[model samples]
Target: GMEWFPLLGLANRARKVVSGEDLVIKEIRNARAKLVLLTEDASSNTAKKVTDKCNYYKVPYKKVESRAVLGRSIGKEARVVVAVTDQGFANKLISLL
Candidate 1:
């Protein structure tokens, strides 16, 4: 929690984060996403799609507390999914989680 949210916000400000399901899936497909953050409250289909893509691409993903928290961290509307494209931020976030 300590390192996760703060660094997440910083990554957002730094423009290293990708929001929305389509963009995140594209990032995963292109191997640009270092880590994916998924909201626990996501719809079943969305969760399945994202997780399946992550699994096939061997990308790491963390299920966060909620969509609101995810959205707030990135200064966006409700986000069910987000991808961290920067390796440094992803590594730090994974360790923190």
Candidate 2:
């Protein structure tokens, strides 16, 4: 339940994670995104767009609690969306998140 944040931080340090809506979307389009983490607090359009992309690309995604929490996981200010590019990190994040 709680291990996800720390593990996400590790992935961030390893540069296997991408944040910001544009960057995440690009990663998904490139087929480099294995998993996406989206904050529940995101605006409706943003959420819909992101989920749609994830579904279109056949990539998995998760809805996290808040933008602050999601950002904190990556040691950033506040992130509405984030993508995990590493298959290994994606698998573990899915298991624990």
Best by TM-score: 2
- TM-score each candidate: 0.95, 0.97
**Cα lDDT tens digits for candidate 1, 1-97:** 3568878999999999999999999999899999999999999999999999999999999998899989988887678999999999999999988
Model 2, residue 72: distance off in Å is 0.7
lDDT of 2: 0.95
TM-score of 1: 0.95
Backbone clashes in candidate 1 total 0
For candidate 2, list the clashing residue pairs, or say none: none
lDDT of 1 at 67: 95
Q: What's the lDDT for all of these models?
A: 0.93, 0.95
